[PDB]
Amino acid sequence: RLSTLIEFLLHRAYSELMVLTDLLPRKSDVERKIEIVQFASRTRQLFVRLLALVKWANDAGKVEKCAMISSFLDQQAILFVDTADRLASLA
């Protein structure tokens, strides 16, 4: 679940730090631009993930309540449909 993404992000950060710190004396302008674009994309993804986490934490109990209500409504609708089908088949 979250462990897979955490390990992937850690490996990516380690590889980026190793590529940017060890071989810094062998980087060109286009390489720096590509690294800046990758960092901007990573920052946008992190901002989106933080916004999603905030939206999930501000309505954590509300999400569970809405899920329970939706499940109860779906169960009631399924029971009603089954009763109607049984009545139609019997009549």
Binding site: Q75, Q76, L79, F80, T83, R86, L87, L90
Partner: protein, 58 residues
Amino acid sequence: ESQGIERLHPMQFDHKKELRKLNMSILINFLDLLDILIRSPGSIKREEKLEDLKLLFV
């Protein structure tokens, strides 16, 4: 009607008596369906009442 299953129809077996029995069974089935839809679907007396009405009609 008095042997094999629940005894509901009397020994008269009149057309009017059979119609009244079918109407009472339909009313009981409707009440059970309303109770199941209103309170909880944990009641299965509707199907049993329908099967009993079908057996009485047969």
